[PDB]
Ligand binder design. Structure first.
Ligand code: FMN
Ligand code: AVQ
Ligand code: ORO
Ligand code: CL
Length: 354
């Protein structure tokens, strides 16, 4: 009621900005996480497997409010090396009839320096949160006018790697020209070699896991190549998936033909299937964070059974608000019991074993 009014009254970008402000100020979880929901992966304990996806808190302003909302882990970003404004407005669109969003933000970012200082101000608070099962991820992007993509990512590793439990090499935004070509075998191998070199140069207690975030629009060859490179280099994990440049048949929203990445329900099963493929291609040995269209416990469990160790959501929050977090968790716990799993861990990749 208070949300859909403010959102019927505000364009989506204004609604987002207000949501970040409200969350950051702690104006918002009764659900107490069961032991069944704990997952150990990426060198950390996660008190529950439901995280906030990149894009909600691009600049690291609302991290504590997000844990208060009940997220088991928080991912901020994408952060670019230099500040940049992103695309001109309007650049985000609701498709309410589809429970979907289309965005073309183009990596609006306060930049590494601003985010560094913001995280440093709460660095020991985060260390305690991480030890308590509430890790922090930092998602790295590249500036629009950058003439060396790998150096942009390297800079991100150097500056924010020491403040993160995991880093994400985001090579799958549909809204930065040329970016998704970095998912190609040769480009990815070169980029990730550099990224891992830089990460390995950080002092041990400041050395994050490194994950690569991939698109839902990849060819079979692209997926096979990514799997090969991830295994060759010892990449720590995959985030599967970013938004889709596809427009599935059946979309009803008036704004369905806006340029950008599509998120929410129409992406859900395309993302699940991409998780399934990547888990198989990596022999279940590479942790996957599953994302795209999660709005229920069933949605979460489907991705977990397909191979995700953790899941994330964003678009569901924009429709259902903060209560969706607890809802997903409570539903997930109930389904795990119904399906005879002792916990989340037992369900990871379960579809591949039946
Ligand atoms: C408004 C918006 C902005 C986003 N910005 C980013 C971003 O900066 N970096 C990133 O890796 N993913 C970004 N994403 C993608 C989400 O992290 C996620 O992969 C995708 O939206 C699918 O999950 P969902 O269906 O739960 O929203 C963004 C998504 C939305 C809706
Ligand atoms: C791009 C976009 C649009 C949007 O309505 N939302 N909503 C959220 S979180 C939901 C929310 C909305 C308002 Cl208006 C106030 C508080 C909260 Cl938590 N994030 C968003 N991101
Ligand atoms: O900044 C954006 O446009 C953006 C980045 C990204 O990775 N994914 C997305 O959907 N939007
Ligand atoms: Cl440091």
């Amino acid at each position: 009621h208070l949300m859909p009014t403010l959102q019927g009254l505000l364009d989506p970008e204004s609604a987002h900005r207000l949501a970040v402000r409200f969350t950051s100020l702690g104006l918002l979880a009764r659900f107490q996480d069961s032991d069944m929901l704990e997952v150990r992966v990426l060198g950390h304990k996660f008190r529950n497997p439901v995280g906030i996806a990149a894009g909600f808190d691009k600049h690291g302003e609302a991290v504590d409010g997000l844990y208060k909302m009940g997220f088991g882990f928080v991912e901020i970003g994408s952060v670019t090396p230099k500040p940049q404004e992103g695309n001109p407005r309007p650049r985000v669109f609701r498709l309410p009839e589809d429970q979907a969003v289309i965005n073309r933000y183009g990596f609006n970012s306060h930049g590494l320096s601003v985010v560094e200082h913001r995280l440093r101000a709460r660095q020991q608070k985060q260390a305690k949160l991480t030890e308590d099962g509430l890790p922090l991820g930092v998602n790295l992007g590249k500036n629009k006018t950058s003439v060396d993509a790998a150096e942009d990512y390297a800079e991100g590793v150097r500056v924010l790697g020491p403040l993160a439990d995991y880093l994400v090499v985001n090579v799958s935004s549909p809204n930065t020209a040329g970016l998704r070509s970095l998912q190609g075998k040769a480009e990815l191998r070169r980029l990730l070699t550099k990224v891992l070199q830089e990460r390995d140069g950080l002092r041990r207690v400041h050395r994050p896991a490194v994950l690569v975030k991939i698109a839902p629009d990849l060819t079979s060859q692209d997926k096979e190549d990514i799997a090969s490179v991830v295994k060759e280099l010892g990449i720590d994990g995959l985030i599967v998936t970013n938004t889709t440049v596809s427009r599935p048949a059946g979309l009803q929203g008036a704004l369905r033909s806006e340029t950008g990445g599509l998120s929410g329900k129409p992406l859900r099963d395309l993302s699940t299937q991409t998780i399934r493929e990547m888990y198989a291609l990596t022999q279940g040995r590479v942790p996957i964070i599953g994302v795209g269209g999660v709005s229920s416990g069933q949605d979460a469990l489907e991705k977990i059974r397909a191979g995700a160790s953790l899941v994330q959501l964003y678009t569901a929050l924009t429709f259902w608000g903060p209560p969706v977090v607890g809802k997903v968790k409570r539903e997930l716990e109930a389904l795990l019991k119904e399906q005879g799993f002792g916990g989340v861990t037992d369900a990871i990749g379960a579809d591949h074993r039946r």
